[PDB]
Every structure is written in C-alpha cells, then in structure tokens.
Amino acid sequence: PVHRLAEDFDPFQDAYMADPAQFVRWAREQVPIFYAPKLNYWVVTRYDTIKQIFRDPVTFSPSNVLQSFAQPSAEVRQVLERYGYAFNRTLVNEDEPMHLERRRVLMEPFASEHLAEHEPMVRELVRRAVNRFIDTGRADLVDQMIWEVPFTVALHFLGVDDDDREKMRRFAIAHTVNAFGRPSPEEQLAVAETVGQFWQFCGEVLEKMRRTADGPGWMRYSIRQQKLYPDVVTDSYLHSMMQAIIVAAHETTVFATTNALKTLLEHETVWREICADPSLIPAAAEECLRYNGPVAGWRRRTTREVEVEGVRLPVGANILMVVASANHDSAHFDDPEFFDIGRSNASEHLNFGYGAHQCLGRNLGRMEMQIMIEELSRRLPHMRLAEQRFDYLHNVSFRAPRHLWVEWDPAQNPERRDPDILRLRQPVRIGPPRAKDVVRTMEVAAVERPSEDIVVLHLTRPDRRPLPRWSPGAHIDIECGEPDRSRQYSLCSDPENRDAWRVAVQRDPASRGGSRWIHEEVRPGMLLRVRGPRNSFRLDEHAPRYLFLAGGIGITPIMTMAARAKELGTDYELHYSVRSRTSLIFVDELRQIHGDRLHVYVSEEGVRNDLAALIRRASAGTQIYACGPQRMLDTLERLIENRPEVTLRVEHFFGEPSHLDPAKERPFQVVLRNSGLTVEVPADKTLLEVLRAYNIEVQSDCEEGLCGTCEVSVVEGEVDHRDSVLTRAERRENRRMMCCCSRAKTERLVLDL
Ligand code: HEM
Ligand SMILES: Cc1cc2nc3c(=O)[nH]c(=O)nc-3n(C[C@H](O)[C@H](O)[C@H](O)COP(=O)(O)O)c2cc1C
Ligand code: FES
Numbered sequence: 001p002v003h004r005l006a007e008d009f010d011p012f013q014d015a016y017m018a019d020p021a022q023f024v025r026w027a028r029e030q031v032p033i034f035y036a037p038k039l040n041y042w043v044v045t046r047y048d049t050i051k052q053i054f055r056d057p058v059t060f061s062p063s064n065v066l067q068s069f070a071q072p073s074a075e076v077r078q079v080l081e082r083y084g085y086a087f088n089r090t091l092v093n094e095d096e097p098m099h100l101e102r103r104r105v106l107m108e109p110f111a112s113e114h115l116a117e118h119e120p121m122v123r124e125l126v127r128r129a130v131n132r133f134i135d136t137g138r139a140d141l142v143d144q145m146i147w148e149v150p151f152t153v154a155l156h157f158l159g160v161d162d163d164d165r166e167k168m169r170r171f172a173i174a175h176t177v178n179a180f181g182r183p184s185p186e187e188q189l190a191v192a193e194t195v196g197q198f199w200q201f202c203g204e205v206l207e208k209m210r211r212t213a214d215g216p217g218w219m220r221y222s223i224r225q226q227k228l229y230p231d232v233v234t235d236s237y238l239h240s241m242m243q244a245i246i247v248a249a250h251e252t253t254v255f256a257t258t259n260a261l262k263t264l265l266e267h268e269t270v271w272r273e274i275c276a277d278p279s280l281i282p283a284a285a286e287e288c289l290r291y292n293g294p295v296a297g298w299r300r301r302t303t304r305e306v307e308v309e310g311v312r313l314p315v316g317a318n319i320l321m322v323v324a325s326a327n328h329d330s331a332h333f334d335d336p337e338f339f340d341i342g343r344s345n346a347s348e349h350l351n352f353g354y355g356a357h358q359c360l361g362r363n364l365g366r367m368e369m370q371i372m373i374e375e376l377s378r379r380l381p382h383m384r385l386a387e388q389r390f391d392y393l394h395n396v397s398f399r400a401p402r403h404l405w406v407e408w409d410p411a412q413n414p415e416r417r418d419p420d421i422l423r424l425r426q427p428v429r430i431g432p433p434r435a436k437d438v439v440r441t442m443e444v445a446a447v448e449r450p451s452e453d454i455v456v457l458h459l460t461r462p463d464r465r466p467l468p469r470w471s472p473g474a475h476i477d478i479e480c481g482e483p484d485r486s487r488q489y490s491l492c493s494d495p496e497n498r499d500a501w502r503v504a505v506q507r508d509p510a511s512r513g514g515s516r517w518i519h520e521e522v523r524p525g526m527l528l529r530v531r532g533p534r535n536s537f538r539l540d541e542h543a544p545r546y547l548f549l550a551g552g553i554g555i556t557p558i559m560t561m562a563a564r565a566k567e568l569g570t571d572y573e574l575h576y577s578v579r580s581r582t583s584l585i586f587v588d589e590l591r592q593i594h595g596d597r598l599h600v601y602v603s604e605e606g607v608r609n610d611l612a613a614l615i616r617r618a619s620a621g622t623q624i625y626a627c628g629p630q631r632m633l634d635t636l637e638r639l640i641e642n643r644p645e646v647t648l649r650v651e652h653f654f655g656e657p658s659h660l661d662p663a664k665e666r667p668f669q670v671v672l673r674n675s676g677l678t679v680e681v682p683a684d685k686t687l688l689e690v691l692r693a694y695n696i697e698v699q700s701d702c703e704e705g706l707c708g709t710c711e712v713s714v715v716e717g718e719v720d721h722r723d724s725v726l727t728r729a730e731r732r733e734n735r736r737m738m739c740c741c742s743r744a745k746t747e748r749l750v751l752d753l
Helices: 001-008 016-018 024-031 045-056 074-082 098-106 111-116 119-133 141-146 148-158 167-178 185-210 216-228 233-246 253-267 270-278 278-292 362-379 420-425 514-519 552-568 587-597 611-616 630-640 688-692 728-731
Strands: 035-036 041-044 137-138 297-302 307-308 311-315 318-321 405-407 440-451 454-460 475-479 487-491 501-506 527-534 544-551 571-578 598-602 622-626 649-654 670-674 677-681 711-716 736-738 748-751
Touching: 001 024, 001 035, 035 278, 041 045, 074 185, 098 216, 111 362, 119 141, 119 148, 119 362, 137 141, 141 148, 141 253, 141 362, 148 167, 148 216, 148 233, 148 253, 148 362, 167 185, 167 233, 185 216, 185 233, 216 233, 253 270, 253 278, 270 278, 270 362, 278 622, 278 728, 307 318, 362 420, 440 622, 454 514, 475 501, 487 501, 487 514, 487 552, 501 514, 501 552, 544 552, 544 630, 552 571, 552 587, 552 622, 571 587, 587 598, 611 630, 622 630, 630 649
Parallel strands: 041 318, 544 571, 544 622, 571 598, 622 649, 670 748
Antiparallel strands: 035 041, 137 405, 297 318, 307 311, 440 454, 440 527, 454 501, 475 487, 475 527, 670 677, 711 736, 711 748
C-alpha cells in the first residue's frame, strides 16, 4: 500500500536515521514524489529530480533549510526573546541574488592552497589520538579521535578560542536539534534555553573578534570584508553564521568519517584492500560518501508554482529531498547497493549539494576523512567492530552513529614489528579523485585468440569474488602498460553475471601503442589495471522497436543491447557485417540467442548490407543503435537527418584524438550560470583545466575527445567542437560540449554548471 506509506511517513525514527535510502526505497522505485502529512512536506527521492532542484535556487529557495519542525510556543518565543535570539540567514539558507554575492565576497579562504595548509595539523592530531589508545585493544573511535580532529581543525579555521569543549558540544547539540530535529513539547523549553545561550556566546565571540579584526580565521576575515561590503556582510549575517558555522564546520565531517569507518569495517575484503594499498583511500572515501554518506535529507521551498515529477506544486510548498536516496538511485549509479570502491562516478554523490550552494568546506572534509582512514588502516588493520547497538540522534538532515566501538589484539599491532610504518605518508587528494585514482586490479582469467588480430579477454577479481553489475553499452578502460595509455573497450559479457567481464580487443594496424601492447603482452594470469565500468552509450529500454547495426569489432556493445532487447521482449533485428570470415566473433553464441533475428554479411564473399534500403523500410518509432567504422556511422546519420520519425544513436571507436595546439587557438570566456562565476580560458588551457582550477567538479577520462565523460551543458554561445563523440546534429544544437577539448566560436559561452 504505497498510499499508506506516504500517509505514515515520518523520518524522526531510527529506521530513517540508520538507512534512509532503504527507508524510502519504495518511493524511489514507485512514487518519486508524495505528500507527507505528518510533516506538511513533499518528499522527492530520485537523483535527476534532486539535481535539477539544486540547479535552480530562484525557484527552489533554501529558506527552510534551517527551519525547526516545532510550533514555537509563546513560551519558547519568550525564552528565546530573553537572549535577543535573532538567527536569520547565513549562507546555506540565503536567497538569491544576495547569496551568490556574499559567497563571492567570503569564499576566498576556502581555496585549495589555504586548505592544503591544514594538512600538517590534521596529521599531527590524528597521530596524537591513535597514540593514546593503540595498546589498549578496545576503543570508541568517535570519542577517542573522530570527533576531536574536525572539531579542533574547525575552531582553528574559524579563529575561535578552544577552551570549553563541554559547553561547545552542548551548544552544538541544541543548535542541531533546533534546526533539523523535532523535540517533543516537554523538551522544547530546555532546548530553547541552550540555543539562547549559544546565540549570546556567539555575540561575545563576535565582539572580541571585532576588537582583534586583524587576527586569524575566517570570521575575522568576514569582519574585515564587512568594512568593504556593509550591505552584503551584515551584522545579522555575521552573528547567525557564527552560530551555524561552529557546528557545520565539524559535525558533518565527524559523521562522514564515522560512517566511512563503519562501512569499511563491515566489508572486510575492502578494508583488507585499503590496508595493503593506501592509494585506494581517496576512491574508497568517495564511495563511502555515496554508499553511507552523512546527508539524509535536505530541504527547499518553492517560490512559484512549478511542476515536479509530474505534479503541480503551489507556491510555498515544502520539499524534502532525500539525498541518501538519490545516492542509491539505479538511474545514475549501476548496481547501487554494491559497495564498490572502484565505482568510477562515485564522486557524483550529492552529499555536498550541487551548484550555487555547493559545500565550501568539502575538500577539507575529504582531506580529514582520508588522513583518519589512512592512519587507522596502517596501524590497526586487524581491528574489527565490537558488538554494540548503534544510536543515532534524530534529525532530518545529518546521520551517523554516536559511537563506534572497535577491538583488536595489540600484540599483533604491525608497528611493533615495523616501527617505520609511522614514517609513511600517503599524499593527500585535494578534491574528488581523478580517473587514474579510481582503478581496480584485475586478473586475466582466460585469453582466446579467434583470429590473428582479435583477442578476447575474460577478466575477474584476483580472488574471484563478485564484480558489480553494469548496463548494456558500458565500457572499461585498460591501462595498456602505463596509467596514461588507457584505452576504452566495450563490455560484452552478460551484464548481470558478476563472475567475470569479457572484452574483445582488435589489434589496430596503426596502433598508437595500446592495442599493440595488449596483443603483445597479455596472457592468462596477468594482472591488469582497469577503470570503469562507465556507460556513455545507454540503451533506451522503452523504445517500441530496435534496429541494431554492428560493423566489425563494433559488435561488442551492440550485442549486449540486442540481448537486452530480447529479455525485455521488444522487437529487434541484429545486423552484423565483417570483411573477412575469420573476423567473425561470437557468431555461434549470437545464433543461439537471436536465431532468425541475426543477419551476417561477409564482404570478402561479396555480400554487403545495403543501409539505405534497410533504413527506408524502418517504421516510425524505431530506435537504431549502431557501432562501426566512421564512414558507416556518417552514412546512417545522413540517412536519418531526413527521417525525423526514427532516431539514431551511435558509438564511435575510431575517432581522431584531439590535441590542443595553443598557437592556433584564442582565449574565450565561460559563464558558469549555476555557480555564479565567470572565468577566462586562455589559448594554452583547455576548458576542463580551467574548471578544475576554480574547483568546479567535472569528471574526465581520456581527456582527448574520444570517450565523452567530460560533457557539459551549454545554454548560450556557439561551440567550436573538437571531440569525436557528437553527431553533426548534436554539434549544431550547441547544447552538449566535451570540455576536455572543445572551445568557442563566440567570444563567450554560458554553461549550466
Ligand atoms: C565533510 C562533510 C560535509 C558535508 C557532507 C557538508 C554538507 C554541506 C551541504 C549539504 C551544504 C549545502 C549544499 C547545497 O545546498 O547545495 C553545505 C554548504 C556549506 N558548507 Fe558543508 N559539508 C561538509 C563539510 C563542510 C566543512 C568542513 C565546512 C567549513 C569548514 C563546510 C562549510 C559549508 C558552508 C560555508 C556552506 C555554505 C555554502 C553556501 O551556501 O554558499 N562544509 N555543506
Ligand atoms: C567507447 C569506446 C569503446 C571502444 N571499444 C572497443 C572495443 O570493444 N574493441 C576494440 O578493439 N576497440 C574499442 N575501442 C577503440 C579502443 O579504445 C582503442 O582506441 C583502439 O584499441 C586503438 O588503440 P591504440 O591506437 O592505442 O592501439 C573503443 C573506443 C571507445 C571510445
Ligand atoms: S574526457 Fe574523454 S571526451 Fe573529454
């Protein structure tokens, strides 16, 4: 009864604190928006919907982000009024256009080079913490380390004197309950009193800072910015922010790190991998954020009528975005319940939000997670979770257990046998991990050589444990002898078969070295560094009819799509053309599966597939999926550019790599509309490199126009396309753009970033 579940929905309970993505799985799957009467909120649960809401803060205001779920009684008001409580807007809950202007004025101390200066402090505090308890054999990781490290760092970043932690903790709990919780009525007056005391304590801190405004920390810097921008950095802002940022600057980092260590210790195989290889830590942390992140729900309120998930919402409608649900959305993350530290798009999780309000401290929080995981993985690889109950403080937005008890045998501490482990340091990842940071080590279980220039590889985990599932069209990248010679190969095994992955690698007659290395070097039992899967050629599973066209080695993604069409029961034909009979691969398998829906054309025997004839017989609604040589794909796109009632999707294997030659190029201007930022791209930089340098997070893989991972959305201007992914019609729309290589025809571009 999905209508009953909506009626009863109530996040203030252990089940939603413990696993909010499971708690709303029914809605993510079947009811992507519902009204929750116990809250007076609309609840949304899918990744695409939540990302769009984040993109549009004019329509979807963050005004209710810090809003209490209580009354307030006149007694509560009166308690609050005694302290002059006037908490108003900070950054996270501020409306446009004021928000972006204040962010612009205040964001500089959050720059990479400043945040990297805190590394020594984080390392020293983590080392101190673990030294205290390393020999005990039992410890609560939260009260012994994970809470104090971000707390200490945060107050130092802020310039707040750190001398009364029991009072600060008391203050932080009350603020959090007040902002995100639902205290019962018999408890609200005590909460209100502590909130008032926190407000007045922040008044005192602020007044001491005003008289030392040249001292350190971000709050004194905001006071100095007030002198220059008094209408932007107000007294109301400064006082409200002081209270909110004392909590925000540590609590969520504590929670993320608590959740990460719990998830890692619950997956012994993965924990053992990290303990043998610290370079996995940036990718493992991102997937901990994706899989078990500290953000449950986040809020917005409509400022106009708007349709959402096919429902027309009135003005002022409250929306709860279940961010944890989005991070488990199978439409964006294949096999989302699989905890996969090789997951190549893990950093697309929404724990840091997206666009205008995107978390300013996120790379400091990442660094703290990484160094804490590192220290524990080096010194306590043999610890395990003790038996315990996990207790969660109820609130709608942030979730972690309050304690994390672990136990180990100190006589097995590896530093006793090898004390120089204490001198090792894994250099820290600033920002999300790059593609070459997200790598799985695989074993070549078998190698078949059906023809002189095709090798079929069967790839498994070295331990043969299960692999994540993928979806038709996905590819992996194999590092062909070095990390900077990575090549894409389409997965062509069964996407649900977790035992192994199959690829077929053609030896290229003019190899730049990649497929040549595979043909000269790969043998069963070898270990390969593999990235992905990533899917840039997804099958629309709701088409009425399919036409699948494979030219040569282009059969590899196409055959996974034809197998899927069969399983869905949709009408399809599979046409497979080769030059030499010896180049046929998988034909016996394909005949068994597809029967009389398979058509094979061997051109050395004089047989070819007349595409103009085959397309003019295609009926309206048909989706054509094709992979083959460049000339075959051009032909299909000329034929389809005059048949609007059929659609074409192509994947290019043989594009020409892009290469920036700055002598032939010009600077251009890019406006990031959602981030409220305008940057210049000089002649010697790609757009991708400039986005990274402004900490705009964009995923990339080949970085040379071939794989399409770096695509961004253009809303104004004319693109000078340099990639090999887009069709001509796509190029002419001036919407999609590969930022690793493409530039501008107009002087400026406007991006939806
Ligand atoms: C480590 C885990 C962290 C998480 C999960 C987290 C979460 C968030 C979220 C969800 C937002 C709102 C995003 C949006 O609406 O688009 C946010 C904003 C913000 N965060 Fe974080 N945060 C973390 C760490 C930090 C740290 C360590 C700091 C400060 C040192 C911090 C400072 C801020 C600020 C100032 C904003 C306001 C940005 C704005 O509205 O323009 N965050 N954070
Ligand atoms: C998305 C994508 C999928 C590809 N799939 C395959 C494949 O399944 N088999 C293959 O031989 N080449 C495939 N290629 C081409 C290879 O990635 C690679 O360019 C080719 O092996 C030539 O590399 P080389 O010049 O270094 O030898 C694919 C390319 C792309 C962009
Ligand atoms: S990263 Fe491969 S196309 Fe840009």
